[PDB]
Design a protein around this ligand. Sequence first.
Ligand SMILES: [Cu+]
Lengths: 231, 251, 100, 393, 51
Amino acid sequence: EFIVVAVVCALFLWHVRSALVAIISLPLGLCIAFIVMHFQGLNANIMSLGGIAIAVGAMVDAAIVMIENAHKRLEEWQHQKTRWQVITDASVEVGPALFISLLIITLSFIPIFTLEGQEGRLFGPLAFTKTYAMAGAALLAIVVIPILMGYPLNRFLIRVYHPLLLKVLHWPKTTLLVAALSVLTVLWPLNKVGGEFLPQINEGDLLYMPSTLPGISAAEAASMLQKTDKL
Amino acid sequence: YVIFEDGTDPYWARSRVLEYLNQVQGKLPAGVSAELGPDATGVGWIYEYALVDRSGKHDLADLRSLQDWFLKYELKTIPDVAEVASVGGVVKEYQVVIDPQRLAQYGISLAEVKSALDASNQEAGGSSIELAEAEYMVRASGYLQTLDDFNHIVLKASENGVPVYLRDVAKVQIGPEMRRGIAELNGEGEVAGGVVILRSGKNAREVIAAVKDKLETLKSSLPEGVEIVTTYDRSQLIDRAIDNLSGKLLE
Amino acid sequence: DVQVIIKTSYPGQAPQIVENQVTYPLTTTMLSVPGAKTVRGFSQFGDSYVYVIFEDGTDPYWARSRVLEYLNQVQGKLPAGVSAELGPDATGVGWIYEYA
Amino acid sequence: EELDNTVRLPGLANLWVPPIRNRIDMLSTGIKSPIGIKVSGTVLADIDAMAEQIEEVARTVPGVASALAERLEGGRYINVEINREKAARYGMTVADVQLFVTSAVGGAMVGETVEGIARYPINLRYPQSWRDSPQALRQLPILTPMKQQITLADVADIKVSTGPSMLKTENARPTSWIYIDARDRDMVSVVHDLQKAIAEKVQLKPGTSVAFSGQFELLERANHKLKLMVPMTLMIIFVLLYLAFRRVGEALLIISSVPFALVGGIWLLWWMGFHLSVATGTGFIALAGVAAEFGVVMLMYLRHAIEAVPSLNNPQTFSEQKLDEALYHGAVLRVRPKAMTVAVIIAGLLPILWGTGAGSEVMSRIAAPMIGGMITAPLLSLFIIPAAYKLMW
Amino acid sequence: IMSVPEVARVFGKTGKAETATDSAPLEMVETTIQLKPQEQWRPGMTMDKII
Ligand SMILES: [Cu+]
């Protein structure tokens, strides 16, 4: 994930070190999460160790937008000490929106803490790690500007987009009706999702157990066990 | 009664007092035991009922047995119920009366009788055997469950003679245990009942509604000619106070 | 769940014997233990088990203390050649290593 | 599959599972059937007789119901009935024969010998020949206290009969469990029909109680609980959403907009074949969060652009289509980071969908919603947001 | 006691009730008494009058 975000950044910005930001902003958040767990135990199970792989992808967006806007405003100023001050100004002009968005995507996970049960207390740690990582990343994005200041093709994208935007704007109600059609057709997979919910976890080890009748001797059991082991 | 300082945790006190309860078990006589108190206070007494019979079919002993071995084992299934305690009734006892003239005729003390009785109300172990591969464990009888069985008991043997049977020296019957607690309704007649306790610091209305609907659904399987009659319930006072306070706030 | 296990291993009997001899007193006594959500008793050939289940969120060690609170009233009431052992401080997940 | 096909011995039904799961399941001393009827009674005969009827009584009610009474009646017991009269005829109490039954046949323990820290038991029993067949037990030599050499059949009779193998006791009472279960349906209404039927058509014996249980019960709470909190949580969004806009229209627009990305994300499980679960719900929550981020951020740029020069001309007379050019310059500054985010997300989440390591099917379940929704949420923002924005007066 | 027109249900008990909380000897008698609804007692005749 780190290497792919790095290569994406280097591709869209033509060899800029903005990737480093991610590598020094996303991991630290993880730390914070773990710290929280240390204050209340919650030993790291497999679900917690898994949820972070998606949490990092959910979190990278703030840093991506920040670096993009910063580079944009810098290139804009190129047309004409306090330089980095106006860079910080161009960063804070969008900071609060990203902060609120991270806070809301954090607090949107309470419904998981609500439910309680074998599966509920199995999943709880996942949502806890999620929320703590999101809050940590919110704070880091609030303080991601110093590491930030420490360091052709998209023309085709805009050429393909702008005509579409001009075409669609003249027919908004058509877009609303298309959204209605989408939220209508969504009903088909909903009613036929299938079954086999809560899949089983595979492991390199296995355990065999046959259902059998009660009656069994001490020698017959050993003989049957040996035969089964040999087979 | 052991009393500690104020503010301490009740369960911690229970643990600490049980910490010195095992050093005296073996030191206590055999035919006794040391029971602990419930997890409630005098306020725990919440519900109180009586089992009445609008007929002369069933006896106090039957009602006591029913209340002890049928309801007690059901009301306690409610989660927040501390415990239920029976009251009144009669405890059916299989009592054996002796005749000293027979003891003199046959010359036998009472310790031998006690030994014989303590060796005629149990079964044996049945460790299995390796017969055909369909295994086959064992089990013996020996539970006293009939008066005719009580009458067929040996006390002393007489080789090439006649063994003395209990029926020839004594007489068995069923009767009332030595009563220590009795209960009664108005002059109608005697009755047996139960009282309900509540765990220190828990809601009342919930458990009251639970026991109420439980008795409602259970009245069906109840024997004929039997009725439950309540005598105490805090729910009335609780709701009365609630209504009074609500009306005062509204005015 | 958070539960406590009580075991009693008799060399050899019939399930009915241990049922009416060792399981009945334990269950009838533990029925009045605090925090008890539900008691269960399994009578098997030779050995008998008892599983006590409480509410969720409660402390395991507190449950151990509360269930032992009613274990001494039945020791003397139990046959001589037997005993009542308690369960370890682990769950089914505790099985970590296995060797031969 | 190869294993299940290779090993096949009569009298067995194979099962293959994870060791930890099998252990924790073994340890679970509960009912696994979605529906379970517990009938409690003072004795075994009465409860068994009741369950016998309950079987077909439940089999009658609609809904597939695999009515299973029990599977415990499989034991094999000797019944050595001690004729107390005959034992008394030879001056022998019950215990005098119970002893022979215990040690001479069973081999009871008498004490432990010490060899340092090691304690070794001591056994005492008759030879293996006199205790092989019931006929051999009928000739078991016995010596009375008076030294009368007799056999066991002279005081008791042995018979053959089956019985139980294990006994369950809930609340220190005999209890029988009847398992009922359907599939691919919520059994919320069948319980009422079943209880009313068994209460109206099946009589109850004095000393018998009936109760219901199973997984269904906990569900009745869980849903309720979330059905009580999900609303409030959503409100916590509204209050926290318009803090950047200070107007309700924007938050309402975002809230009505997130379902588009929801659908984009949910449409993938059909292709992948997976099935929803709690983890898919968490994935949905994360997708909605990122979609709300996109929407909020694009709306901030639209509000900053509309406040530009055209802010003076648009209120002058009417629409003045030229205002759309603002949106032009308001949108070119957003496609680049959006494409970057979508590309990184897709290229980071693909191998989890197409990878199997340790606990990977789960991770794929959690990652599917994001990959499925990252194809609509960008389109959603880019297109439908500015439309509704211009349509906001 | 039941002779009084205002009392509805009485319940007399002597001794203990097979519980650890009660320690009443065979002479201490405790009689629970339920009263009729206030609206139905009698003209006037407050609780003090009843006792
Ligand atoms: Cu197993």
